[PDB]
Amino acid sequence: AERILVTGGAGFIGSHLVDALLAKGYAVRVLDDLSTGKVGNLPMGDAGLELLVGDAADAALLADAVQGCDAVVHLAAVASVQASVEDPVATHQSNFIATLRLCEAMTAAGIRRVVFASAAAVYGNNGEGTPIAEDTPKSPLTPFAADKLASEYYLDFYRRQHGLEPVILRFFNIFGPRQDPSSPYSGVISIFSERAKAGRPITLFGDGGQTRDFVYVADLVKILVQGLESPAPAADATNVGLGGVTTLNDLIGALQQISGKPLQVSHGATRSGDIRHSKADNRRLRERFDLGTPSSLAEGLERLYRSL
Amino acid sequence: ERILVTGGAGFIGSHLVDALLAKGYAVRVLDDLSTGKVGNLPMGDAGLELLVGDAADAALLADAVQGCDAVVHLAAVASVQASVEDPVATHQSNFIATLRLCEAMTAAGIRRVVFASAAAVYGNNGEGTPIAEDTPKSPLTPFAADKLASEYYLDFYRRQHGLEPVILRFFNIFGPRQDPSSPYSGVISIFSERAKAGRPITLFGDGGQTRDFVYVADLVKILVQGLESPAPAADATNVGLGGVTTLNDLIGALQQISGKPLQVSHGATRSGDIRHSKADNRRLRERFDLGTPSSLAEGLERLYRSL
Numbered sequence: 327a328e329r330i331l332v333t334g335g336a337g338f339i340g341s342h343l344v345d346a347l348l349a350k351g352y353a354v355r356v357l358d359d360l361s362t363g364k365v366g367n368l369p370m371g372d373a374g375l376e377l378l379v380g381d382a383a384d385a386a387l388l389a390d391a392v393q394g395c396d397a398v399v400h401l402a403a404v405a406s407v408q409a410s411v412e413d414p415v416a417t418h419q420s421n422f423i424a425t426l427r428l429c430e431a432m433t434a435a436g437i438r439r440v441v442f443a444s445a446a447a448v449y450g451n452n453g454e455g456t457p458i459a460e461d462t463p464k465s466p467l468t469p470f471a472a473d474k475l476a477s478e479y480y481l482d483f484y485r486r487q488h489g490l491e492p493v494i495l496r497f498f499n500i501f502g503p504r505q506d507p508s509s510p511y512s513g514v515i516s517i518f519s520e521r522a523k524a525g526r527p528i529t530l531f532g533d534g535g536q537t538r539d540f541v542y543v544a545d546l547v548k549i550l551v552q553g554l555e556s557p558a559p560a561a562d563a564t565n566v567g568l569g570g571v572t573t574l575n576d577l578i579g580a581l582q583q584i585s586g587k588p589l590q591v592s593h594g595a596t597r598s599g600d601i602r603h604s605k606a607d608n609r610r611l612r613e614r615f616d617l618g619t620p621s622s623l624a625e626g627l628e629r630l631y632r633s634l
Numbered sequence: 635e636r637i638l639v640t641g642g643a644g645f646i647g648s649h650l651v652d653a654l655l656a657k658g659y660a661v662r663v664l665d666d667l668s669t670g671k672v673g674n675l676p677m678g679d680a681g682l683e684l685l686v687g688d689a690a691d692a693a694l695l696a697d698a699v700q701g702c703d704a705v706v707h708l709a710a711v712a713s714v715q716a717s718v719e720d721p722v723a724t725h726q727s728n729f730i731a732t733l734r735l736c737e738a739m740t741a742a743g744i745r746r747v748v749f750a751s752a753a754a755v756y757g758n759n760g761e762g763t764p765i766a767e768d769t770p771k772s773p774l775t776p777f778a779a780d781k782l783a784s785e786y787y788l789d790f791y792r793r794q795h796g797l798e799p800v801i802l803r804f805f806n807i808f809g810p811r812q813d814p815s816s817p818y819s820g821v822i823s824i825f826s827e828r829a830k831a832g833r834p835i836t837l838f839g840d841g842g843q844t845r846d847f848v849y850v851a852d853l854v855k856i857l858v859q860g861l862e863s864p865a866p867a868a869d870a871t872n873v874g875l876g877g878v879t880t881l882n883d884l885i886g887a888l889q890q891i892s893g894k895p896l897q898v899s900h901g902a903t904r905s906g907d908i909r910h911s912k913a914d915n916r917r918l919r920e921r922f923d924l925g926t927p928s929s930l931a932e933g934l935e936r937l938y939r940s941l
């Protein structure tokens with residue numbers, strides 16, 4: 327049985343990927359420092375699962391972790407953009423050095439396929455209010471965003487210089503069960519859903535007209551598995567957004583209806599770094615992957631709410 | 635007023651150090667002497683202070699910026715090929731040193747930093763076209779990705795912490811003290827050393843390739859203006875002259891300077907070589923006082939006369 331190394335596999339997106347890889351018959355090795363990841367997210371009773379707790383920027387750990395692995399999915403990073411604004415030096419280790427060290431370890435081990443979690447943040451404000459195509463000029467505004475873009479550049483260098491096979495995916499806004507809502511900068515759907523379940527007020531920053539291209543985690547996981555299994559993945563990046571439009575106000579009403587309970591909406595000022603309109607151009611994604619019928623917002627919110 | 639020059643013992647840096655001392659600045663050099671040479675520096679000037687160490691070293695940088703009014707950040711492993719051979723080690727010099735400097739400048743309250751970026755951030759996208767600053771980016775090596783990442787971090791420190799970066803993308807700089815010791819050294823430093831020594835040169839390709847060559851003294855003038863301008867622009871500026879010199883032109887010009895003919899061996903075209911590279915220097919002309927730059931023949935004669 328083939329083995330998949332998944333960095334950041336104990337986190338929100340990773341642990342769902344781990345569940346799906348195991349069900350398909352893969353062996354899975356998780357590398358995670360448990361900074362936001364959780365052992366309780368993993369099916370520790372699965373004989374096909376191994377867990378290494380450590381830093382993904384640690385070259386000695388990566389030299390051990392890649393041995394016996396046939397492919398990689400690189401999800402480890404400090405996901406909070408705001409954390410990179412507060413501490414660019416520390417987060418640069420997790421958000422870029424880990425990518426560089428993984429490229430070194432994969433090339434030494436002879437492993438070619440790596441699926442990489444890049445981010446819509448590399449566009450910055452360029453293309454706002456339009457479907458953002460992948461060749462939109464880049465404008466990373468934070469150390470996180472610049473580190474994701476730098477990661478793409480280095481992955482492409484190892485592709486051309488050393489035969490690596492990167493699958494670069496720029497996630498738009500992912501949501502669903504296990505997304506951690508404990509931070510004021512957690513994803514808005516995890517925060518809003520947690521408050522609605524508890525019967526407590528949510529806070530809306532701005533007028534609510536901001537739009538996001540939300541993707542339910544199970545649809546992203548399908549794309550991640552396809553990235554591991556495709557015979558000759560494209561060299562350049564692929565947006566993972568649906569090209570859908572959801573205002574925060576749409577989200578508030580849909581969530582309130584699903585919860586069956588009243589929802590108080592308090593106000594706060596528009597966030598300083600807030601992009602108003604964000605939407606992916608889905609053409610490369612629809613050409614390169616079989617999306618099937620993705621979950622609608624309502625379907626994804628219901629699955630989230632019913633899990634808590 | 636004291637200026638910190640990281641990489642100040644190198645080719646461009648030491649010419650800058652000379653100019654800054656001549657203008658009355660005190661100058662502090664931070665250099666690890668990997669390629670820089672103390673012989674490039676006017677040691678015992680009494681306005682010159684030399685620190686030897688790693689520009690990525692946090693504690694050394696904290697000392698180096700203390701008492702400094704401005705910074706020129708030239709330290710990097712200049713060789714693209716060394717970054718191909720060792721991405722991990724060169725990332726420390728080519729990017730971490732920039733991040734650590736941003737941190738040290740913010741803590742010490744120093745705003746102005748002139749930064750040596752590079753035409754390599756464009757990859758091959760500039761082939762055959764005047765290369766403007768919004769030419770799409772395609773850094774092909776760790777060196778080029780690190781220069782561009784340095785740019786992005788510098789802009790983040792500008793918006794988040796009040797830094798004043800002057801981002802300059804150098805095209806093909808040449809002149810005295812440029813190390814001709816590598817096969818990948820600048821073509822002018824290699825051809826000039828061979829012409830002075832009366833030894834054959836190797837031309838990779840047909841010699842029709844064109845480059846936008848900039849004599850180091852003209853770049854140094856731009857660097858000083860970056861330090862002294864009252865309100866520099868936030869985005870990058872290409873440093874080229876918009877000049878077009880074929881390698882066959884360069885060979886003929888050097889033959890005429892040296893007085894002897896140059897034997898020219900024929901090599902294959904380098905893989906990935908850009909055939910036609912020219913800056914669109916409109917932003918340079920608008921933001922800086924270019925005066926009358928040295929022609930190629932002028933810069934070649936000054937280089938050749940110093941060998």
Ligand SMILES: NC(=O)c1ccc[n+]([C@@H]2O[C@H](COP(=O)([O-])OP(=O)(O)OC[C@H]3O[C@@H](n4cnc5c(N)ncnc54)[C@H](O)[C@@H]3O)[C@@H](O)[C@H]2O)c1
Nearest residue numbers: 334336337338339358359361362363382402403443497500
């Ligand atoms: N909307 C989204 O969720 C979204 C959007 C764009 C990009 N991404 C990217 O997707 C990936 C997964 O994010 P997520 O939403 O599941 O959040 P997450 O925080 O739950 O997952 C991040 C995981 O990485 C682990 N990790 C962090 N630093 C590490 C290190 N130095 N060494 C080892 N493990 C480390 C954490 O413990 C956690 O399990 C990240 O790269 C993130 O930046 C997510």
Ligand SMILES: NC(=O)c1ccc[n+]([C@@H]2O[C@H](COP(=O)([O-])OP(=O)(O)OC[C@H]3O[C@@H](n4cnc5c(N)ncnc54)[C@H](O)[C@@H]3O)[C@@H](O)[C@H]2O)c1
Nearest residue numbers: 641644645646665666667668669670689709710727804807
């Ligand atoms: N045509 C060109 O010469 C050209 C073109 C584009 C960019 N640049 C950039 O201009 C700057 C100067 O390059 P140069 O042509 O003068 O070459 P150079 O090698 O002579 O100068 C580089 C200097 O930086 C120093 N240095 C290197 N790593 C260091 C470290 N970790 N800590 C401290 N000092 C360190 C070296 O000792 C040397 O003195 C570099 O950033 C280079 O990438 C040059």
Ligand SMILES: CC(=O)N[C@H]1[C@@H](OP(=O)(O)OP(=O)(O)OC[C@H]2O[C@@H](n3ccc(=O)[nH]c3=O)[C@H](O)[C@@H]2O)O[C@H](CO)[C@H](O)[C@@H]1O
Nearest residue numbers: 714753754806818819820821822824836837838843904907
């Ligand atoms: C010295 C230098 O800064 N080189 C940089 C410059 O390369 P460039 O190719 O622009 O400059 P170069 O000086 O390395 O070479 C210019 C031309 O001369 C040719 N040639 C060179 C040596 C020789 O002995 N014979 C010969 O024919 C060479 O193949 C090339 O066609 O720009 C690139 C980015 O786009 C990289 O940043 C390179 O590192």
